[model samples]
Target chain A: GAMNSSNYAELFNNDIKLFVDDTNVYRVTVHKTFEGNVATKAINGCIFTLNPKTGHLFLKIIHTSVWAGQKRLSQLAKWKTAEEVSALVRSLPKEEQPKQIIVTRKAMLDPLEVHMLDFPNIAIRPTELRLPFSAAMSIDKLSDVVMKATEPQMVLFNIYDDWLDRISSYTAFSRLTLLLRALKTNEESAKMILLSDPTITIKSYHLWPSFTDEQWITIESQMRDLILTEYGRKYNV
Target chain B: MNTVPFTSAPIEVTIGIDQYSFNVKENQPFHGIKDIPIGHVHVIHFQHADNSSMRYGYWFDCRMGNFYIQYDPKDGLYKMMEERDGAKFENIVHNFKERQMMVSYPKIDEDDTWYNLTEFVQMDKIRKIVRKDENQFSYVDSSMTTVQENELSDPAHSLNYTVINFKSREAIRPGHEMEDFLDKSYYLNTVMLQGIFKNSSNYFGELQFAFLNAMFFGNYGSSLQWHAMIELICSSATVPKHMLDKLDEILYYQIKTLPEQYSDILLNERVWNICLYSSFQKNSLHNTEKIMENKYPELL
Candidate 1:
């Protein structure tokens, strides 16, 4: 039997949420949420994440592997239709889309839940449809809803996944932007140090500012490698 | 007919934005060339302007068709440039307009999608406002614009005259150069353009790409110390307060010795004339009166 969100949360604890090692820096938890007639809970099934520092290269390998294994076991246990799995990603743009969507990181257990805002109902009515479905019916029920959904509803599913993925990419790219910003700061600090040191190392060396060169080269190289390897063939040209 | 034995020879006209007035004989066949008229035109002694920037008036005469060679300033062929600024200056040579202007030359396509790296970096650095809105997603590098990629791919064998395409990739790695030209990435292209016009003989499509070389990887400050920078290296000049900060303090003790080292870089007859012209444009006299103003202000 697949461990529920609470079980995963109890097992991994802190390691599941955020992992830091010598080679890796930071990672974010990605999950799929289903809300409808059945249950208003999450599926705790699949996860996607990225390497916080290096970009797109999901940093927590151990957590990702464990999560992927469990997802595979669950898929084999009951059998999930393509429609159910597809719902997680349907909302994203095709070009920026991620594939074989899985919640590969245990950090996304999301054990805690908080109530969001509710407003007074304008059009109140009682219907045969239930307010909230059973928790187990979350993914299954959402899948069934999706299977019978109108074209626009189906579009909503795709776009929802897409929106999440874009947010993920935006988050990843934002880190890169931050890294570059930090590099500029690092450059400024180095310049201050050089200017104040009173070291006459070489004549005409001031013309060649040492800080700008070293830091720029390192940063440029890092950005080049990252955008190339992990972004895949998205921008092949 | 006593055609007086005049020593005056016909040559292309050149101008400097800073040039002063010069004496010209009557009916002297002349052309003005240079971004700004230096001093004299309607004579062939100085190189004529192709009128690259067109900030000046256009001398584009239709009377001279394919034989147009390049825009000669003597006939005032480039004065049309200034008017075209307010009016739309299309590169199109219509049949009637072609006949009117004697325009038999091969027309330059304004829509030429092809951009050599030289032009790319040149404009990128110099014309920041123009490129500030352009996107970079089309290229494989994603960092490069389409124009950059096209110019970068030019091989040694594919180059042609008037293109100024330097089989650059064969000799130089494009990284630093790219950064130097990228939208305000590092090197200020506009400032470099000013430097180029201030220093080199202006022929945009010509080889040696001196401006590009200097800004890209050329030991610019050292080049400046022994070249243009020497003029500003003086301790007394007060115009641009910024130049003083760029001075290498290690080389400061021997500041007086710089001009002599600078002379080793060949301040030839041509250079001497160009400087004289610059001086005259800068001052109104055909002498060092203006140069003396900056370098020796108290004397002025």
Candidate 2:
């Protein structure tokens, strides 16, 4: 409990840092001194609040700056100890390695600042990432051809909706000729999927530019071929 | 992809600065039965909001049905409409202001039209149809039966005749709801499947689908071409009670499993016809045999 100037504002000397910034206060702040032009480079930091006396880890993260990098995080890797964080950071190939490894520790003493206390922080390498004709909502806009269209005429409507239901999920999105079987590729349904769908493929459909008859025709044609080929090939048909 | 049947690969016929082209099967079936009225007369006039006529939208002269159209999209005679005609055709709009369909989305061909029912029961026609209890009128006298499965009747014994038969019957009867419509479609699809396959097992793929498409499109190819296939199927022939049980399963599996070449069938309503066709047939077959078997005791 002896307090001298030696503990005051102690700072680690790396691109990543942990500093004890007060008198007798056990503060572990992981500070990332982001280098380079802010416009050209992105900076991220992940911090943890461990019980200083016991070294025991808490269930919740004292998320500092790098939550954006949760982009690569798996739910399973709950960031238990700074060890998992360090390993993933070290695993980053030098090209992906954004900066030097640093012990983490931050301030202002707000609830957030208080949480950041004694937590390790690090930034992650940013990474690159990647019908129909049947939407029921838009169907109403169709004059009455479909409103009172012939049976043959309206089936496209149902087929379109059915496609929507099929692609509603990502594990749901994989497989098949569109490369739902591919590494990626595909189509859309009536409620045009927004560009922001958490789950998407390059089939990455947008709802703009109302569908053209030709566009629908090609889709119907291609998909018809796709379904037939998909099922037929399996059965020797 | 049924390249064999697709006499030609798909052609990119354009409309509105368009050129039309034709595709033929290696050979064709039911060569346009020229000069005969097979279905009801529907002289559709695709007129624009300006009240001017389309370069001829589809006029089915009461006398010569499908073949009678002025802009014969089917005939090798016209073979295909020229770009000029195609352009004139696209410009012609039948703007139904009362139409609420596609009213929300801006028009794709701001000049052209767009055309669903995930839950078709939500549709105006289906929704507005009088419910069974609300339907009070009964025919003074009536029976529902096909003309003659055995005889070659006028309209050459095809779906046209079936239409004639149904139109007459439905004329006397009050309008029905979507359930009955779907039920009948399901029934008709099965009967035709059975009837056509009865004569030959391989009576499917493009031809059968085309017929169903025709039935759905409100087009009856003017002869028994449509009817002849289903004539026996729709007939009261004593289908061995167990026959239909086995009938739908075989027919549908075959159609549903149609070769990838015909996989396009999966995309169209024809797939729906067969699947829903089979779906609606099963429960009723037992009931159908229950009444039909009473007279044809031999099946028992």
Candidate 3:
């Protein structure tokens, strides 16, 4: 009931692929592909897929290389464990985490995908193995993958370009990190903001030289409250 | 025994101000004192404002632990008010002429009530002695008395004694004995040591103290004044040139790193503006000083 021709077209426009199972659960996958070697594609290569009805998010790391063995592979091998990433996500400001989540995969759950369920408000249902790109997925039933009259405008937030230079390095990173987590508590459309890469540089930047340590703390706290409240209202979360 | 007597001009004696003058004869008794080689005797004659005359006598043997006493004509009592011990000197007369010798005694009245009159004649002499003497003079002993007459009693009760030492030239030298003495005195502990660093002068200790004050406690006004002081020092070379350079380095680092380590409530944008203004004012003053030094070399 949640899927429609409009929703189908929206996914197709964003280059998102979906696989429908017998119970009608859709496994959606969003990814980027390159024509060159693994190093060339590793710069910002990532895949983020989500189910709007169940508020579930899945992540995968893919590699492209010269040899066939260096093909699409899991990115979670070198990254943190699923529980660790879950801990980090749960540790974020409370308003940022999901209210609830439906877990549809267990045995084949990519650690990166499992990390998405760590939000404080999230609750996972261990019902069945229903997520992840299948090894023998059907691809011949793409006859309805047609373009829409009007495509949804995708918004991208570059943490550095948006706030870091305007305020300072520490303040920008801390506030935006909190905001990213807050946005994740909303619909799948809002989760894409966090899925994209946001740079975190080690060097400190100061836009206001006279600001004291206490003032910086107060300003950041104010910004966090403002972003959480405003984005909560905007997303109706 | 040889004796020495020093005489003042006819110091007046009355109910209030009392003094005497005397001469000494050769071959006087040593009065049981053995520190100096001679007997010292004093005969003071007091002429009141009304033309009446009074006389007093004193004897000092100049020995260690030897006491000096004055004769009280009304009660015929001798009161020893001071003691001097183990002072070795060659000539009392020459030392007195060189302003290095001193004496003080107590004055007694008819009712046996006594007052210390040592200051009546000795304070001026001590002031002059401190001006010329190079050695140290320490206190020995003192006593006081009370006369009750419903405030109409003995006028001589106001008489008192005190020995004061001035800051000698040698004391101001770096690491000098006088500096050590002053450091131990109550004046440094209670008074100047607190805020004197704000406008301190060329002494290395004082400059460092001032620099620390500016670093920790400086406000806009204080910073401006401190900057001006640094400029003055740089222009004239009152302190060592290298010391001034060190202060410059310290101030530079302090201003450049503001708001980093500091978290004061007063540290806002306006405060930074004021600090920048102070620095600008300091630089302007420095430039003016340079121009003035170029035009008027004598002034700097």
lDDT ranking of the models: 3, 2, 1
lDDT of candidate 2 over A1-237, digit per residue (tens): 121235322212223321111111111334445564232222211222221112121211222233334432322123222333333345546454323221222121221221222222332211111111112123222223322432222111121222333343221122111322211122243123222333332221321222344554454455456556646756889
* Winner on lDDT (1 vs 3): 3
lDDT of 2 by residue, B1-300 (tens): 000001121222211100111222322221111122123222122222232222212212222211211223353211211223433323331121122111121223432110100111111111112122221211000011123433423322122123223212231222222222223442333433344333223332223422322322223332223333333333323344444554444333323323334334223433233432354333434433343234322323
Candidate 2, superposed: residue stretches over 4 Å from native: A1-237, B1-161, B164-172, B175-243, B249-257, B265-267, B270-274, B277-279, B282-300
lDDT of 3 by residue, A116-139 (tens): 422323443333322332311111
Candidate 1, B130: how far from true, in Å? 27
Candidates 1 onward: DockQ, in order:
0.01, 0.00, 0.01
TM-score of 3: 0.15
User: Is model 3 an incorrect, acceptable, medium or high docking prediction?
Assistant: incorrect
Which window of 10 residues has the lowest lDDT sum in candidate 1 chain A?
Answer: A110-119
Q: Model 1 has how many clashing residue pairs?
A: 58
Error of 1 at A206 (Å): 54
- Over 4 Å off, model 1: A1-57, A60-237, B1-26, B29-300
| Residue range A116-230, candidate 1, lDDT tens digits | 0011111111122111111111223333443343332222112112223334533433433333333333434333333444542313311222333355356445544544543
Ranked by lDDT, the better of candidates 2 and 3 is: 3
Could you give candidate 3's per-residue lDDT for residues B124-150 as a string of tens digits? Answer: 232231232221221111111112111
lDDT of 3 at B249: 47
